[PDB]
């Protein structure tokens, strides 16, 4: 792992759906996402912002944050690129971000998270690839 | 189901229903409640039963999902086996013709470091040995590596199964798509293979090769990945005086301060640094390279200096960029700071030239005169420039505009003895239209010191002396001033002697001279007339009189150390000042013990009673900022049991909803009304909750101003200095003795500590401990100290006030 | 004690009162060191008239009490109690007379270290009209 | 009146006080029911049990439950610990106005506005009884503390007394076989509407809405729809005992008796709550609290506080005492009056209490004071601060008003106050509101005396006759004069040793225990002010400072003896026991143990053999036995406990023999310890031990340095090699110099690549050949003569000592 979790957040003060690749961040996932994404991840409208010693990468969509978190890093381009591919995959499942529709497609999003980032290493995904799985 | 922790009974119902959608939704609802962290094992048999063999991917994918985030915990429908209900019919899943189900299955199966699934994950690499996508081959190198991680660092995971077992990492290098999960601990042959791959790259894959093996002999060979490493490699091959001219660092760097002025201000800094490496005196700090954009040819077209002018600023771009820019003008070009500060100040300071640099607010005008003038005091060359510009400042000819002008220049003359003779005649001019103190003060001082040079003085002074405006402080300044320099060297209808007469009347006497002075009664209570009245031993003549004083400057006056100076350009300084730079019966006995730096609250729990207390449990609680690092764990407190049970303690936490008292300790036992009792172990205070923080003299000063600290007490046993009892006690009410607010000498020398804390109470805490330790024949109260205290509504002020006396606890069981 | 209040929002006037009174009495009732320490901070960030007041008071304070001279020197060398603007001019005079000169003048000048004027008791009449307005 | 609790909930139709705990239930018109910890301020439960008004509320405390009745027409039973509905039952067919619980079996009574009150058995299928009589609404049903009888207040103008085990009511004539009820004109006129009549009570005030009892009286008071309250005897149905209280303006919802005062508290549906005289039965006073109407009332059957429900919410209000004065003699607590009458003595962790006869107070306490020998109690009565009242003296072990009127003991006489004072039988009294002295002429003084007067201070309470007007003033025995005055900070208490000659006063840290007048014997060590603490005349001081009773000291020992489960005040120490009573005044007693006390009495008298037995788990802690005994710089205590690897380490430096250190240092698994003990080792003198340590901390270079100093050459060589490899140039380098020939350096330096340095070193010793080797392998040129010699003799005679300083002699003490 380099990538702790890949997480979709609502800044309602909770992690709406989230993925723990291997059992580590269960409950931990919700508290991080709930506090930090509310402040714009503590950002200023900057894609990288780091708070409480955890790197948060994000994109705001409505009252929701699509969030990538790492606390270690292998390369600059890479962290954005998994988030980015995630952002192609997320409106296919939920038609933008929105807590109720995100909630309903926990399975869809979660499965994509496992597929996209496997054991914290950023694999690649695409909307057609996603189909074989949810078929 | 966003997060609803009681809903597990409905999920079981929804999980099998004869409708596939409902089953999928149910299993989905389980996933979302676990991820948040909520109840899930009740369901297990139901969950597992529909999905198991099928090639129908969606339910299978859903079940596959739930096996990487909780498989181990849930056991109703799974239990413990080698071929669990996670993987038994998921050997089918692995061996389906559809790549997605196999691929997914492979991917979760190998992901686990589970030992109850070690065997089923090993030939699970079969599912992705054939590579129908880039995803399949990547999925495979990552899964073999994850198998290697899961207890197979030897021959179970290293060779090939039929094509990969730790060999996709080799294959990937030469195949169309790359990705190397080989970062650590894996085949040497693949590492070598990645190097070859640098050339025949796949770009995502190149970032994977590259985290493992970096540094190239080339320029590049292509793609963002190689490119990103490359700027790191370049900085190596030329470290010397920063990067100077930023490499491929520039692209990420702008976003690093997207909020919005700060980028330009930063950019301006680098551009200034880069121009040249100058002398590097006080605010002449430009590093980087000496020549790379030079400075100052006379054949260079359209020159370097055009960019240098931007940096000279009034605000010419916006304030953040302004503060950076003024420092940056100073930094490329000056002598120190002085040269370019005089030019810069000439533009800023008030004139008759431009009315976009003059203003009728007196302090700012005055400050600007002092900034220009401080450059002279710093460096000589500037004296010659300053005095004529100062006369232009005067030429504004508003009462106040003259006034500010006169006030600094008069200080300059104290420094600059009979050098500024020339100015006096200009300075008189605007002294007649008058509505303020300042003009009278300053003018009377110039005209006074300068008398030898001129002869006008009865005429100039007299219109003002019989004119009105505001005259308190006028008295003080005219008192020391009016006679000075040469005993009889003036005359218009009042020679220098009339002036001494006048000077004395204005101070506090009475005399017809200059058609009487405006006022006589002096400024603030201490000053009075008398010193000067005694003075003028030799009538206004350079000897040991007013003239002496006037043509001399009080203490050292040099530089921009603020000794007749003001420290750069007045507007830039406001910003720098702002910058604070802050850095059921139960019996208990107890003591606190420390062994091998483990801090523990020892508790002994005693049942002196014959009665039954079974059902005995022991807990240490989290009250607020107090916390258990592990409660006492014995099931003791039984009929006539004596036990020693250790509860580990922490002092730092986050507020809990239960009571906030001393320490809560809970023992449980038999009883059904008071099954749980709260009983105590020895003292811990409310004071713990405060959080220590520190201040510097600027933060202390700012906070002093910000909110009152009038409140004082005198605390006994502050006989001692700051360092001893007072620091230790102050520490326990999470405070710390930092910077001073003292002024020590042979008559002064109370010890002063500036305290700070930032309490978890919605307040800060500050105090000053003054220790009254005799440095005079009449002390306050002798040894003892008076602590002047505050907090932000002074609710913690009081804590400081009494927790600096004494404080000690001990027991010896 | 009152001076413990607020460093520069307390105003020119309170600082001038503790300063004037500490100058004039020359405390042996309490140690002047607290007073001096309190006034020293106030001067930095408050108006010219008080900072000028503080140097001149210190000088009179010197002449009346010998003991005091060491504190006068730490205070006056500072950029505050001297070398500001008005504060400098008064200071150059007051300092030079204490430091340099005989102090015939300084001695003469302190008769207690009294105020600049002695009026009547102004407050009470003012107060009478002002309250039910 | 003090407001303990006040929570705005909106219209509370029902209110009930818990008889077990100091809790309140309210049933609201909003359909919500709430259970409150009114003292703690913590909401226990909250249930919306019905849409509309819930008019009745009760505690069902026989097993820990509350019962409610609502206009759902049901009596429902609820859990306050698990928040679930335990059982549900059909009370009636209309509004349940009030509900009451039987303590016989889990039977529930509901009173309804459909004219019956019924009792229902859940445990079985049976409805055991229905109790009928009303012709219009039974508004209320109320328990007496006996469970056999109930009263109901109904709006058909009666109060019906019922039996719950009985069919309706239970009675049978012994003078006739016939039924008690007559439907005909007999000696009274009523219908046939009962099975039999035990007691039909008046309630005529156009129907009584509520009825309630005083906890210790059969008398009941009822508030009714009119504007009167009528007090009834329910134990006889008399109409020669019934008085009407008039004050209210509109329909009185209830009237109940104040348990703790001799007044009757009523509340009405107007806008006022009125308080009534209970020896006159008419309105003393009216209060308006402007929460409008009151529909319910409650009087506490646990005799805690008092409460009335209003249309905005409810208030529980306080008419009780805090911090009362008290003294303990041998097994008797004497205290000044508090709620729940007289109590005390016995228990040790429970909040229960029980009675003993030791009432210091048995009448309104003007004064309560102990004799200084502790044989009499003075109780001053008939209140007043005029110049007269009565004072009654009681015997201390068992207290009556008078013991016998025919015996000198228990007499009374006049005196505004009388309070005992030293000479140990004497008292001083005020009987003119001056200080008068009291003798009787032998024995404890009971008789009034008028001689001797003063003109300072004013009569009140005390124990040495305390009087106040600006301080707490102690007065003399036989002199009018003030003996002394005390002024200090208090926590609302005055603490006596037990003998009332002496007094303990509380200060900023802890408490100080003092003698007669104000003379401070000692100060109790403890950071914070104790609540109370008492000294067993001197020596053994036991105190409360939290929830635990601990000894400040016994014979220089320090202990926490035990914890109780409640906060408490020590009543005093007379005997081995310490006795305590809190604000509510529930007792705890505690035997002073030979636990903590024996252990340190033994350790002080340097016994370790005694102390091993003494070690028990009622006193073990962590640092009073197993690590406090590692606190001697010449180890004694230290030798005994050494079990911790750290304590062992410590022990060793304190002796200076580090042989043990190395092992502790080992068992601390740490290098730092080995280097520090090695340094201590060099200090005891012997370098063998130093070498071993220093070698394994890897300070081969320190060793190299040490070694000629030590005079070894063999060991010095070992260091050189194992420092060669480290390239410690102030380690490997040393040794060559230190032996007479330099060759060691030459090779090490060769390996460093320092060929120059290697040649210079070698060459000078006349090992020019090696020096040349280095030159030849590397860059030559050896000819050069530096600021040091390059070829001049190096020879040193190494260490003339035959026995080295690794073999430094020692004897060791």
Coordinates of C-alpha atoms in Angstrom, one line a residue, chain A residues 8 15-18 93-94 96-110, chain B residues 1-3 25 28-33:
Chain A
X8 CA -16.0 9.3 -1.9
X15 CA -17.7 9.1 4.2
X16 CA -20.5 8.2 2.0
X17 CA -18.8 5.1 0.3
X18 CA -15.2 4.2 0.6
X93 CA -22.6 4.9 -11.7
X94 CA -24.1 8.0 -10.0
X96 CA -22.3 13.4 -10.7
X97 CA -21.9 13.2 -7.0
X98 CA -24.9 13.4 -4.6
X99 CA -25.1 11.6 -1.2
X100 CA -28.3 9.6 -1.8
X101 CA -27.4 8.4 -5.3
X102 CA -23.7 7.7 -4.1
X103 CA -25.3 5.7 -1.2
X104 CA -27.4 3.6 -3.5
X105 CA -24.5 2.6 -5.6
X106 CA -22.2 1.7 -2.9
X107 CA -21.5 -1.6 -4.7
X108 CA -20.8 -0.1 -8.0
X109 CA -18.4 2.5 -6.7
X110 CA -16.7 0.2 -4.3
Chain B
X1 CA -28.6 3.4 3.4
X2 CA -26.0 6.2 4.1
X3 CA -25.2 4.8 7.6
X25 CA -29.3 -4.1 -3.2
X28 CA -24.8 -3.4 -1.3
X29 CA -26.5 -2.1 1.8
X30 CA -24.3 -4.5 3.9
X31 CA -21.1 -3.1 2.2
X32 CA -22.0 0.5 2.8
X33 CA -22.8 -0.2 6.6

